[PDB]
Structures are given as C-alpha cells and as structure tokens.
Amino acid sequence: STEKEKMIAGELYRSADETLSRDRLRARQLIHRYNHSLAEEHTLRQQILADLFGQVTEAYIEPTFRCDYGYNIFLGNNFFANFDCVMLDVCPIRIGDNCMLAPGVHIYTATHPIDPVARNSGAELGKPVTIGNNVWIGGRAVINPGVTIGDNVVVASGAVVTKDVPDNVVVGGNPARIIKKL
Amino acid sequence: STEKEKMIAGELYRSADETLSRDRLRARQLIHRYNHSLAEEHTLRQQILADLFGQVTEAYIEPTFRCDYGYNIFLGNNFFANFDCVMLDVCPIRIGDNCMLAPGVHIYTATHPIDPVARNSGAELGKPVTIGNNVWIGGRAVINPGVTIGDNVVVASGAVVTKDVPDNVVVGGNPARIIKKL
Amino acid sequence: STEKEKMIAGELYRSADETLSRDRLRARQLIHRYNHSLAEEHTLRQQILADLFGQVTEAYIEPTFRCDYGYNIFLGNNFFANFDCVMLDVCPIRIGDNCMLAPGVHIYTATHPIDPVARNSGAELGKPVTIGNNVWIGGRAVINPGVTIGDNVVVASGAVVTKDVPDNVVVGGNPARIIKKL
Ligand code: PBM
Ligand code: PBM
Ligand code: PBM
Ligand code: PBM
Ligand code: PBM
C-alpha cells in the first residue's frame, strides 16, 4: 500500500511521502487562494471548493478556512461554516446535509500514540470523523478524531467532543456530555 | 418595524434585509482598515473605533479584532482587549468600565433554535450580552448570548460562560462555575 | 532591578518601560518576519528563532506563531509546534526535549491580581511555566501561568491546565484532570 492509502485508511503512514507532500502543497495553494479571495467572488470560491473537497455541492465557508488535504472532506448539501474553521483531514471527515459550524470550529483526525517512545518514533496516524444531518456546532468547539456525531445534534459552543454523540441531543462541556434531549 | 429594529431587539429577523447588509459591509470595511493599520497609527485606530462602535471613549484593542455591526457594541471607559478578540454583535454587547479582555476572547449574541426544522427554516435571532465594571476575562473564554456578568468579575482563561455571573466572583470551567468569592 | 529583571523574576513590573517596549518591538519585528516567510526559507526561519528565543536547537514552528519577548522562551531539542501557537512569555517558558504542540496551543505567563482595585492600579505581573520532556499538548489547549508539567505527559485537546501535572499521565478537561496513567 501507498502511504496515502494507509493514511486515509487510518493506518500508520509516513507524511514525508512524496505524493502526500505534493498533496499538502496543492491544498495549501488552494486554501491560500480561497482565503485571499473577495466575498463578491462566488464563482471563484465555489470553483476552488469543488477542486479542494472530495464532495461538495452548496457550501458557504467564510475565510479563513484551513484543511490539510481537502480530498478527505466530504460535505453534504447546504453546508455552512463561519470564519476560522479548521478541518484537519488526515482521514475522512464526512458531514451530512444542513450542517452549520459557528466560528472557529476545529475538527481533527490526526493522532499520536500516548506512549512517548512510540510518539517520538515518527509514527503518524489518524482517525475518521463523521457528522450527521442537521448538526449545529457552536463557536470554538473541538471535534476529536474518531468521533461520530448523529443526526440533529446541537454541540454547544466551546464543547470538546471526545466520544460519539447519539441522535437528537444537545451536548456541551469539556468533556462534552448530554445536556438534554431534543 | 424594520428588520434592523427586530434584530437589535432580539427578535426573529432577516439578515438579507438591505439595510442590515449595508451595515455589515460598512463594518467589514472598518474592521479591515483597523486590522491592517500600522502600529504608530494610533489616531487612525481611535477614529475607526469611534466610527465603528455605539459607544467608546478610551479603548485599546490589539488587532485582529472582529465584530458584525459595530454599532451594537457599547464600551465603557478605559477598555482593553488583547489580540483576536471577537464580538459578534447581532444584539447589544454592553461592557462597563475598566474591562480587560485577554487574547482570543469571543463574545457571541447570535443563536438558533435547537429544533432542526426551525433551525433549517432560515430563522435568524440573537440575545444581548451585558458585562459589568472591572471585569477581567481570561484568554480564549467564550461569553454566550443572553449572559449578564456582574461587576468585579474574573473569568478564567478558557472559561465558557453560559449563565449569568453575579458580582464579585471568579468563574472558570466549561461550563463556567464559581471558583471563589472575591 | 531594571523593570526587566523584575518582570522575568515574577515580580511586579512596569511594561511601559523603554527597554521592555523596545524588546517587545524587536520581538514583533522578528515574529512578523517569521510569519510572512515562505516555507522554503528554511535558513531564514531557523535564523530568526535563533535570534528570538533564549534557547533553541531544532525547532519546527508553523506560522502563525506569537510571543511577547522571545528571550524568555527556552526550548529543548527537537521542538515541534503546529500553527497558531502562542507563548506569551512575560516570564520564562521552559520546555523540554521532544515536545509536540498541536495547533493553537496557548501558553500564558501574565496575570493580574483578582482584586479589582489592585488590577485597575496598573499592576503588571507574571508566573513562569515549565514543561518537561516528551510532552504532547493537544489542539487548542491552554497552559496557564505558574504551571509545571512533568515528563511524558499528554495534554488532551482543549484541555485547560491550571495546576501542575505530574509525570506520566494523560490530562484533559477544563479544568484539566488526570484521565489515566501512562
Ligand atoms: C491501488 Pb494500491 C493498495 C498503491
Ligand atoms: C448564523 Pb449561526 C453559525 C450563530
Ligand atoms: C496584559 Pb493582561 C489583559 C494577560
Ligand atoms: C546587574 Pb542589574 C539587577 C541592571
Ligand atoms: C500529526 Pb500531531 C503534531 C496532532
């Protein structure tokens, strides 16, 4: 297996890999163009996002936006994200329809072994993140690697999501807990 | 009743109202000027803040700063904010005298219904935020919509404030709780 | 004691002090140059950090990076920090070998008295931060003033650290608590 295939599949990979280095530069180029583009530039922004992401249809994303690869982000219909959102997509980040991200939401997929020896060994690895339909994620929340958020979930601002979230609940806190059922 | 008066009053409003859209454009223009202002350009900075806010006297605000409208921000005397502070002022954000915001403090006022049908309906709404005199808000705190913070309050770094905070306490945590009486 | 000596030693100091002011200005110049440097400007980035920090050997720091003075930052071998990290170094921030900071980690040393009269009095003070060897700090964590983090610690994303952390543990939450032993 290619290092890219290993990375996407959530296995140990090498980021210094040639293809991956090139992929990150391509994404950086597109991100940079996205972020310095004007808001009146709809065709350009839409064109850049179609190029960047694995899947996208309607998407309103305020700069500044950031991702690592782009092709690991899969966004359902009518996606909305306020400024300073970060989607670090070492592994697939799959988001359903009608998602709303408030400002400064961070979604991570990269991780490291907790054991220091292993960590300092160059080991690189990620875990996918999946988010359902009609999910609202409040300002400055953090969604950790390997998390699955169900449909119709409201994530309060500043929440740090470390475990799966079932359908139809409001979560909040660090660590995030169920606040109430919808 | 114009959409603007509805917005400010904390009622359902339509952001696409032409007057509100002109208003956000003006704010972005002013914010952009502020953020790219060289350092010794203190006059320019002061004049921009006088033009942007609903009320301001002495105010030291390190770029980058961000707000939505500007005119819903009312700042008391001797206001101070470190870099990357954000005041999303769909509704009034009233802050008393001698306020100190550390870096990356976010104050929000916009909200959404928790019900997904209602949320996906295009319903736009906010709640005011009021902060007292002599309040010190630590790095990366989040102040949520509808919250009132009393006088002489210390908000610990990273705190996420979801409810009123009475006078003379230190609060911290997410959710933020009383840590000690002053 | 020059105000500088007081600042560094964690005593009440006056920031408006000319050398300090010059020192902060110098730091801003270097940071600015670092932050706008293109990637392949290896030589330059490394040269700038050598000039900025009190101690550094191998350090990979993704822009944007930010500090107050630079000379209060002491970094051990093989230092790594992702983008948006902030080290506000009014007092010494001493970090061991093989440290890894995920994006948007904030380390603070400045503080203010909790008493309002004393706070509004112009009182300026800091507390040193010390971090051990082989520490991995997750995305958007906050390390507060006066904290000491032992060796082989993993600080979970979004954790807010307010008290010392002993060797060989994973901490997480706000406030951060021991999640498990390593
Ligand atoms: C089509 Pb392959 C498992 C580098
Ligand atoms: C228009 Pb909503 C990301 C507070
Ligand atoms: C210079 Pb004080 C708002 C951490
Ligand atoms: C050798 Pb002195 C405490 C400016
Ligand atoms: C691939 Pb690590 C510096 C969150």
Residue ranges per structural domain of chain C = 1-182
- Strands (DSSP E) contained in chain A are 59-61, 65-67, 73-75, 79-81, 85-88, 93-95, 100-101, 106-108, 110-111, 125-126, 129-131, 136-137, 142-143, 148-149, 154-155, 160-161, 169-172, 177-181
Place of tokens 């609903």: B54
Task: Choose among C168, C175, C170: nearest CA to C143.
Answer: C175
Structure token digits, residue B37: 């202002």
Packing angle between helix A42-52 and helix A18-36, nearest 10 degrees?
Answer: 160
Alpha carbon distance C158, A113 (integer Å):
18
Window 144-173 of A: residues touching C by CB (8 A cutoff) are 144, 160, 162
Determine contact: A174 vs chain B, CB below 8 A. Answer: yes
B113 contact residues in A (CB cutoff 8 A): none
Alpha carbon distance B69, C163 (integer Å):
39
What strand order describes the sheet that includes C79-81? C59-61, C79-81, C100-101, C136-137, C154-155, C169-172, C177-181
B151, B139 in Cβ contact below 8 A? no
C96, C134 in Cβ contact below 8 A? yes
- C119 with B102: Cβ contact below 8 A: no
Virtual torsion, Cα A68, A69, A72, A78, nearest 10 deg: 80
Which run of H or of E encompasses C142?
strand C142-143
What's the CATH architecture for C1-182?
3 Solenoid (2.160)
Q: What is the DSSP letter of B89?
A: -
C121: which residues sit within 8 A by CB, 6+ positions away?
none
Please report the resolution in angstroms: 2.2
A169-172 and A177-181 as β-strands: parallel, antiparallel, unpaired?
antiparallel
| φ/ψ of residue C39, rounded to 5 | -60, -60
Q: What is the DSSP letter of C52?
A: H
CA–centroid distance, A145 to ligand 5, in Å, is: 12
The atom of ligand 5 lying closest to the CA of A112 is: 2
